[PDB]
Design a protein around this ligand. Sequence first.
Ligand SMILES: [Zn+2]
Lengths: 985, 9
Amino acid sequence: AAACERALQYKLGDKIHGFTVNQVTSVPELFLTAVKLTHDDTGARYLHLAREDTNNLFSVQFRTTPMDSTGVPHILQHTVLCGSQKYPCRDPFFKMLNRSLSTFMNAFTASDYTLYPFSTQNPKDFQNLLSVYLDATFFPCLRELDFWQEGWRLEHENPSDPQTPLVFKGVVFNEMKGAFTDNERIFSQHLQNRLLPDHTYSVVSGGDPLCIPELTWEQLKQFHATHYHPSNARFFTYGNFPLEQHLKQIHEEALSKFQKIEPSTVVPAQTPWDKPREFQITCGPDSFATPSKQTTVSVSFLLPDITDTFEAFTLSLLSSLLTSGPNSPFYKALIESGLGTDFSPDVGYNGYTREAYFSVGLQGIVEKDIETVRSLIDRTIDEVVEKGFEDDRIEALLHKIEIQMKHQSTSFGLMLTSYIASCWNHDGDPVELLKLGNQLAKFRQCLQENPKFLQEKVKQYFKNNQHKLTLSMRPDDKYHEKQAQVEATKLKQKVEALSPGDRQQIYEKGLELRSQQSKPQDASCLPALKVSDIEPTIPVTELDVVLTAGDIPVQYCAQPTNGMVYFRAFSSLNTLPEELRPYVPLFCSVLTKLGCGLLDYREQAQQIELKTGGMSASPHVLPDDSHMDTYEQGVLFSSLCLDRNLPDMMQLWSEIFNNPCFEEEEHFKVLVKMTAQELANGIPDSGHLYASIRAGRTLTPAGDLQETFSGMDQVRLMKRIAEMTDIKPILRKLPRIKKHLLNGDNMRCSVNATPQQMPQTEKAVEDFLRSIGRSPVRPHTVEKPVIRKLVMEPTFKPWQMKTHFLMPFPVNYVGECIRTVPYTDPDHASLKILARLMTAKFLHTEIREKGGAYGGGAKLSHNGIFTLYSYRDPNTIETLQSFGKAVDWAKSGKFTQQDIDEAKLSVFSTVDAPVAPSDKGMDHFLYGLSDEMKQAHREQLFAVSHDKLLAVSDRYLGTGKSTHGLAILGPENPKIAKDPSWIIR
Amino acid sequence: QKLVFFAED
Ligand SMILES: [Zn+2]
């Protein structure tokens, strides 16, 4: 009381529950006090960040250095969460997700470390999660069958019929299969391996799909015994919870059983090359557009150790000056050259490895131009050495960091442990990464003392560095087909080596695993919260709405934004002609990048980066809460700035609204070719989303509109525009959109700032609103109470549709959508509970555990759309069959009252998630939900009973009772192709 | 709750 204040009372040398205080440092710019502790007996390191933040986070970190691409530290990370000595029950992790009110619960495996973080606002929940995490990581039951499920296994297509052929299955096996569906991730992986070929960075830490089955159960157990010793661990906490409680728990449960060892886990320094290297690799074809401009090329430079914190901080800043924004050297040299479509993957500073590295290059080039690019990179470096950087860009970059430092997030503790992990992993000082005020200061001093400081740095690490790597990638049209071929051989090689005794054990063990996944077991050894631990009411959000200039509503919300101002504006699309609708996302993406007034796009970019934290526009479809076929369509303008630069931001908005430059045609093609490239590369990672959006297009007008704005239709459209030889006819569409959008006719605004700043904002905002012009196509328009004008399509008829996108993927993405009821319907709360209920107790088991898919479940949206989905699924038909078996299971009522409570806990853990000061209260501003509506809906979630779950499952999810929509992203499926009820695109 | 499935590369 307070948290950062109490931490300063700790004396150096203080002994606390087996720990010793080694250092206490105040970091006022982050409102926290850092405390370093060491465990006396084990030598385990501890970092505690004391800050008055209720969202407390714990994390434990292990240095994991694999020497093969089996993915053993990744599979181990999955497997240690499958059972422990104190909690021997099956799957403690996934069970605790529904027995807690956490804000975060997960695990990650980097190249050379594994991280287990969780966060919660409930102190009792913290202890519960702390006991389960400590026991899982240090004392796991590493049962053979849990390894077969999460890693890889041999299994009959029907585990009960030993005459069926044996196949590969596993969660990680399919997790990594789909991970390398992303070509950028393929490129990124090979870059690191070729650039750092000496030690653990030369392998695939996550797992190479072809090398995963080379992993034995024994190697998994040996790897754990070698790397998961507390002497090889980093402990981390953040928040207001008493530190003493943590240390007492960590010591008495786990650390007490160990004694100091010297971990054989150090990553040696990469020995620098005397001569540069070139490598050529291959990837998968394009999804799904065009065929010669598809080569990716990159040049990479080896940098010093990240444990040298200031030089790392320096080179990271230098890396932003070199590649970030249209004023960066490599942007003008590579992007504006028209040779490619976008930067190569992993552009800029990469500080995950011990030695960081810099990369720059292009994708979407013709293979003949590879030397052209390399020469440009060569020429650009020479010019930077000779000319250096302008001071206003250095000021702009330092202004951005200032914003990143002052901004208030809800997952601050998670970002901090992630931001220090690499440095800490190699025995660096994580606290020195926190003193950003010092690094900024020293950086400024280093510039004032040496005007050629940055020029000599580029000279050292780019012009004189012989440790250069040139890597080029060209796609192979049969890449995944070739992969399957080798996979089929390794499979046969593994089956051939099986003895008759081996074959019986695989049958029996496989049958035992299937039994484990089906048999309902007890989880009472696990700690748990109850529904009584959920707060009955929410804290009221205080607002005041003022009509301004002369009847535009502006919403003011006083918040501890720490000297930050957040401005938002929403302009309706009701006056816009329907012909121009598909071009609105494109419009919004270039509106703030084409120049305004006397500012060209270069000059405009300089101001935005120097005065604001960013200004963006995006199209939104906001469904009504009481009518499925009612929605609000518009564009959300969002901007952010420091207290002092507020007038500049609103002046920028005024000029963008009154004089945007829709004439910069050359830069326009660059932005379009870049947006299209980025959209196509991100399809696999968001495949289930693109599947869900298509599946729901035929169910709701809003769903139909969302498909136009961000569906595959939008991806396909953007690609066509980027293929256009004459871009002018698209460019002429923008002024037409401008005259309907950029005015004050159909507008409302919101402001989030400190109460001390509020009166100053009321002026600048009001001045902005008066500087924009003043004075609907669809039947009808509804007025809904301070008035929003919504589009109603009361003759909308939902229609069943099934779609299969033929993608060259090794995995599938399935989505099934059902039209239910909206937010204010009492059955909506039941459906919300049911969705998580089905996920926790059915779909997760069928699709993920048995199937081997990486993700699978059900969710219910605000728009009343019930969606079932699978993510990186080796199956398609069997997945859909599981969708049907899930609703039949839901109708059977064969679930307990405890399962309902666990579903409630899971739901409230999501809706009661912490809200950043910048986002309160966007729910009122966007969807028009009062505190009254939310409390009513909150108490309905409380009143949800078993009979209401049976009634609502039979009322909406049954076959023929409601309208369904289906979509699949994945390779060709003969069964689907012979079904006339499926459409192939 | 959150972040159900566990990563990464
Ligand atoms: Zn994983």
